[PDB]
Every structure is written in C-alpha cells, then in structure tokens.
From Swiss-Prot, chain A:
Part of the 30S ribosomal subunit. Forms a tight heterodimer with protein bS6. It comes from Bacillus subtilis (strain 168). Induction: Strongly expressed during exponential growth, decreases 2-4-fold in stationary phase, part of the rpsF-ssbA-rpsR operon. The operon is induced by DNA damage by mitomycin C. Binds as a heterodimer with protein bS6 to the central domain of the 16S rRNA, where it helps stabilize the platform of the 30S subunit. The lineage of its organism: Bacteria, Bacillati, Bacillota, Bacilli, Bacillales. The chain holds residues 14 to 77 of 79 of the full protein. This is Small ribosomal subunit protein bS18.
UniProtKB/Swiss-Prot annotation, chain B:
Belongs to the universal ribosomal protein uS2 family. The chain holds residues 118 to 226 of 246 of the full protein. Part of the 30S ribosomal subunit. Interacts with BrxC. This is Small ribosomal subunit protein uS2.
Curated annotation (Swiss-Prot), chain C:
The gene is rpsE. The N-terminal domain interacts with the head of the 30S subunit; the C-terminal domain interacts with the body and contacts protein S4. The interaction surface between S4 and S5 is involved in control of translational fidelity. This is Small ribosomal subunit protein uS5. Keywords: Antibiotic resistance, Ribonucleoprotein, Ribosomal protein, RNA-binding, rRNA-binding. Altered S5 proteins have been identified in a number of mutants. Some mutations in S5 have been shown to increase translational error frequencies. One of its GO terms (cellular component) is cytosolic small ribosomal subunit. It holds the Pfam family Ribosomal_S5. Transmembrane segments: none annotated. Belongs to the universal ribosomal protein uS5 family. The keyword 4Fe-4S does not apply. Signal peptide: none annotated. The keyword RNA-binding applies. SUPFAM superfamilies: dsRNA-binding domain-like, Ribosomal protein S5 domain 2-like. Changing residue 110 to C: In rpsE8; suppresses S12 mutant K55D. RspE8 is lethal in the absence of the S12 mutation. It comes from Bacillus subtilis (strain 168).
RNA sequence: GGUGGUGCAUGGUUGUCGUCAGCUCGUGUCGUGAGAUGUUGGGUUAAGUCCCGCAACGAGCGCAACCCUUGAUCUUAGUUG
RNA sequence: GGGGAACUUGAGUGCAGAAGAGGAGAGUGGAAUUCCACGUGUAGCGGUGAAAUGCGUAGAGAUGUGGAGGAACACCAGUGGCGAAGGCGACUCUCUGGUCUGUAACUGACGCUGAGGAGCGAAAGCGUGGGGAGCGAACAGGAUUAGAUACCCUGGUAGUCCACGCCGUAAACGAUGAGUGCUAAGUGUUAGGGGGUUUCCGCCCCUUAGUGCUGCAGCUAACGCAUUAAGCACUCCGCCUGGGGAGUACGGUCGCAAGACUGAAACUCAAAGGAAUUGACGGGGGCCCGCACAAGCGGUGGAGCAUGUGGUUUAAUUCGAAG
C-alpha cells in the first residue's frame, strides 16, 4: 500500500497527536500490524516507541 | 496408409476406428511431416532452446552444427549459430524462416 | 572431436560385477561390465556394460565405447610430460620415463595403456581401488595432455624453443 | 528286487498369495556407480482398462477378447422326439 | 632479513551523519493468574481415552467491587534489529560499549593471527541471606496396566526470582577456527549515500554494509555448497589417525562440593559409521479395493452319531501331510 508518513514526509510523531495515532490502533486497542498499514521500518519502530508511551498517559487504550 | 485405401480395408467397421485411425490421428500429428527423412541430418533449426533444451541435447551429443533464433537467456555455449531476435513476434519468426528457406531454395542449382 | 569408428578396436575386458536389486519376492542378480576398447595407435575408450546375462553385457560395452573414444599423444611411445589426474576420489598420476621401462601400472590401468600402444608409463593408484573410477582417473588425465608442436602453436613460438 | 532312507540332491505334478493388476526387456538418455526413467503426472475403468501429458519411443509376458455353457431367433433335419 | 629516506590504498584518528530488544543502575505502570475481604447467588463444579482422587451446604464454581503480593512483559513480531559468543523484547531517565555511511582533514604500515596467561559464558547445581503468585523435579494420592518406581490426573518440596560469591559445562550449531583479495547472475529485505524529471509522493539507475532464497563455472564420494563458499590461493592457532575398552582408570592442578580440564593401557572384534538406491515394513499420511467390515440370513462351539488327525494304547495300531 502507501506509507501514511511518506505521504506527509513527516518526522517525529509528537506524542499528543492522538488522532494521528488512532489511525494506527485497532478497534479494541491493539497495535495494527505493519503489512496491513504498509509503513516503513524506521517509522514502524517509532510507532511502538510512541503508542506505548501514550498508553502510559491514558491517551490510548490498552483493551477497549 | 496402404491398408486404408489400397489394402484390406474391410475387416470390421470399428477395428479401424478404435485402433487404426486412432493411430492415424496420432502419428500424423506427433510424427508429422518429418516422416520422409530416412537419414541422420546434419542441421537443425529451432525457435527457443531455453524452452526446449531437451531437443538440442542429442543433436549436440553427435557433433552436429545447428542453427536457431535464440532468446537472450539462451545458451551460446550450446549453439554454434547465434541469432538474437524476438522469439514470439509472428512476423519476425515468419521473416527469419523465409530467408533461410529461400537460402536453400537458391542453393538447389 | 569425436573419434570415428573407422579403426581397429581390440576390446579386452577388465572385470565383471554381479549387481543386485531387491523386489517383493527376493533379489534380482544381473551383471555389470566395463571393457577398455581401442587400437594400439593412440585411441582409447570404453563404455558401461549392463544386461541380465554375461555375454550381452560384453556386447553393449562396445556400443558406448564406439560412442566415446579419446586420443592420446604418443611422443616416443611415452606420455610427453608429467600429469596427475584427479577425477572422483581416485587419484592416478602419470609419469613418463625412458623406453626400456615397460608398463608399470595398476590392474585395470595396465589394460588401458597397452590399449593405447604407449608402452612407457610409471603410475601409482593413489585413490580408491574401484575399477570404473580408476579408468576415469586415467583418461581424464590423458585428456589434459598436450603436444609439443601444439603448445608452440598456442604460444606462437618455435617448437625447438620448447626443447632449446 | 526294494511302499529301504533324504522332496534341503531332482524332473514332473498340483496349492498358495489371487484371476489379484502386476513383472520385465530393446533402443535412447539420466547418475562417477547402485539404479532411475518407459511403468511416474492428469482423467477414468473390473483391470499397466484407456486417453492426455511426459526424456522417452517401443515391444513381450499378463488383463480382456477369440473357447464352452445358458439366455432369443432363422435355415436345414423330424424318429425311439 | 637489517639500516636510511619517501608514497597512501591496509589499519587508525578527526569531522558530519544515521540505525539500534547492546550492557549496568534506581524508579514506573497495564492486562492476567492465584490468594483474601464482601455483596449477589445454588449444587455441584473440578478433571479425562474413560473416570476417580481432590473442592463443596462450614456456601464452592460463575459473577461485582475492593486489597496484598510476586513473576512474566500481548499487540508491534518479521530467514527483522544488535552483540564476539552465551544472549537481550513493557516504559522512561542516568551511565556506558562497539557498529555503519559521508569524505580526506590527519598519521605514514602503526597491521593480521595468536601456545600458555586473562576475562565473559543459557539452563542445572552450590554457599549466605532476601522474596516465593503461577509454574514445578523428589515424593504422595487417584487411575492406567499382567507390572507403572512412567506418559495422563489433583496437589505438591527444592527451584526458577534478587543482590553477592563459585562451578565454567551443552546439538556453547552455520554440526562451517580468525583475517586479506579474487571469481556469472537474478532476487528480496535492514541501514545509508549519489544521481535522474520531480518540493514531492514516487519510480529508475549507480553504490557501501549485514540479511535470506533460486541459480554459472569450478569444488564435492553423493545430498548439497554456490560474492555470507564447502571455488581457486596465502599467512598464522586448535583438532583427527579404525570401533569398543573411555572421556574410564591412574597422576597432577582447580573447586566449598557436585564434577570440570590434561589424559592413557592391558584387552577385543574385522569391522563399527558417511550419503545414496531398490525394496519390505510403519500403533505415518493420500487415493483405492474384495462378503473384508457394517446392514441381514443360516449354521459351527452345547446333544447324540458318522468321519478326520491328535495323544494315549497295544504284537503292530502302515507311511506321508502340521498356521
């Protein structure tokens, strides 16, 4: 598919961008996989670097 | 073929159908118009040895210089005469076989 | 090139192996054969021999023998130089010598060199003692021989310059 | 002369796997060689039956068939029927 | 080989980048297991091939909130990252190792390998305390079975877990000792860099580095291996010389011990193993067949009697046939 980040060409996720993150989160709260989203390896490793932190600030759910 | 028109054609009406004419449909296809050979020839023309290395092997194995249009992935170690062209252009495979058939046509004198 | 069948082949056998195969009932004993075939003027070859009998395997050895021959240089009834063949775990080296030295070779190998006409070879079967591969150890080395006038033509050089 | 001995000296003779769908050869190649291909793959059949595909093309012993019986009818022949 | 002097590609340094589950430290959460407090609520749940032991009218199991406590860190997860190997996956911070690119600024061969020596090295085990929710050797119980000191079954001690000290072994595996160059491709994939139209996105091409697969020459005994070599060459270190006896005994070091490392011999077989092929078998799979089985009918094994071999019995019970 198409990388969502390279469509913007965008750097650092800036963790408060919850609605930008919620596109990459599944229905119940799990992490959407790489091959469905079609991101990049540099970007996919920043996602779990970001998504896990917003889980610890209650901005992203664990299991909903 | 001597039997079906000149020989004993009247044995059964279906011995020829099950066996003889079923043989006639096979060998006129699968042994075709090379049938009047009676000799070991000294040349061969093919279209794709990369598709059909199998035919080239025994021709190579008896030291026979052969010709052929080849694809770019073919074997120049194998063939003595390299002809690089489109393997599936219907005009070009008619064109290149026209020059070679007219080569031996003028060489009949 | 391919050596033609317009020669005088002498074709004495080397060994016979009885060779089995195990079916529902029991074994099936057939025979194997290999015959060194050639003249005494520089053309040596062989073929395999497979049948269900003794003598028809001797027949079918001659076919692939006449399908596969090879030629050896006979400089002074010697091999022209020294070489070591290495085909398939049987090493057999080849050394030239003077003309009185006879044919000192292994069992099956002695039935090869006399079927070259070349009567001056020292050799020693380094590798295994198996009859097919020792003959494969000979002709593969004999294939890699060279002639004195040929390599001077390869180098673009004088033939006598290879000697002096 | 032995119906004396050994069917692990034998011919011959039959059972048996089972009337099961199999066993090989010739040529060609394949693999240093043993062997492998043909016989495997696809579709069927009671079946190596048969078609298609197929580095194999073929042939041989098998299967079936031609042999009998019973099941219909005609010709010829009708007694002891 | 030695000495004297230069060059910069080998290797190193600067500088500019980029990747990271690399290590060590103190702290932080989120589901989930159990435990316990209690509401609500009734006869069972629990477990298996089947079933029992265990748990339960004293109120279990299920369910609702709340509480303690440990250890494990889903999703991302990928022949994906990194380390020399063992290994490391929640999160953040502090501290710290190397890696790769970009050149050129610098050094002027400063390098490679390395016996002994040194340090690291999963799991088990050891010594001292800490902590012990799951899990769990030993043992116990219930089955299973001719036997069950086993697989199953409910519990269950050490352990695992932490700090610190030691043992220093494994299929510690890529069954491939480390480095340098060279030798068709095609192909993904992780990190870059250069360019070509383009801010782009992108496509295409060139290019370093690990990372996988299919492949030529050649190597190979065959399977296979193939720019990450088992190709062709070279420098260095370890190891093997038939199998068992045996990694045993003895002798010595080391350790808190368990045992590790160095390491035999008398004896004895003519062979033990390597890949490969045809077979036969499989309480391995796939297709498929016969009264084989299922769905039925009628008998045999009880009863007398005929008959046939057994054994036994006799003067001999003629000999042969034995799933």
């Amino acid at each position: 598919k198409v990388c969502y980040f390279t469509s913007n060409g965008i750097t650092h996720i800036d963790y408060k961008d919850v609605d930008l993150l919620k596109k990459f989160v599944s229905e119940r709260g799990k992490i959407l996989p790489r091959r469905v989203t079609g991101t990049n390896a540099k970007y996919q490793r920043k996602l779990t670097a970001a998504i896990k932190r917003a889980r610890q600030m209650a901005l992203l759910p664990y299991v909903s | 073929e001597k039997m079906q028109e000149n020989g004993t054609f009247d044995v059964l009406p279906k011995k020829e159908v099950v066996q003889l004419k079923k043989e006639l449909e096979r060998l006129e296809k699968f042994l075709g118009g090379i049938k009047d050979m009676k000799d070991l020839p000294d040349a061969l023309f093919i279209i794709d040895p990369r598709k059909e290395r199998i035919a080239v092997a025994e021709a190579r194995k008896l030291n026979i210089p052969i010709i052929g249009i080849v694809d770019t992935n073919c074997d120049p170690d194998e063939i003595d005469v390299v002809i690089p062209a489109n393997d599936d252009a219907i005009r070009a495979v008619k064109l290149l076989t026209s020059k070679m058939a007219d080569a031996i046509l003028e060489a009949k004198q | 090139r391919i050596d033609p069948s317009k020669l005088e082949l002498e074709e004495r056998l080397v060994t016979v192996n009885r060779v089995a195969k195990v079916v529902k009932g029991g074994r099936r004993f057939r025979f194997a054969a290999l015959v060194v075939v050639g003249d005494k003027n520089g053309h040596v070859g062989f073929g395999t021999g497979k049948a269900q009998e003794v003598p028809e395997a001797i027949r079918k050895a001659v076919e692939d023998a006449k399908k596969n021959l090879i030629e050896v240089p006979m400089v002074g009834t010697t091999i022209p130089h020294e070489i070591i063949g290495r085909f398939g775990a049987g090493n057999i080296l080849l050394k030239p010598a003077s003309e009185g030295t006879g044919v000192i070779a292994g069992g099956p190998v002695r039935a090869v060199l006399e079927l070259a006409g070349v009567a001056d070879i020292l050799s020693k079967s380094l590798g295994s003692n198996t009859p097919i591969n020792m003959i494969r150890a000979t002709l593969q080395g004999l294939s890699e021989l060279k002639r004195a006038e040929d390599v001077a033509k390869l180098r673009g050089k004088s033939v006598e310059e290879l000697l002096g």
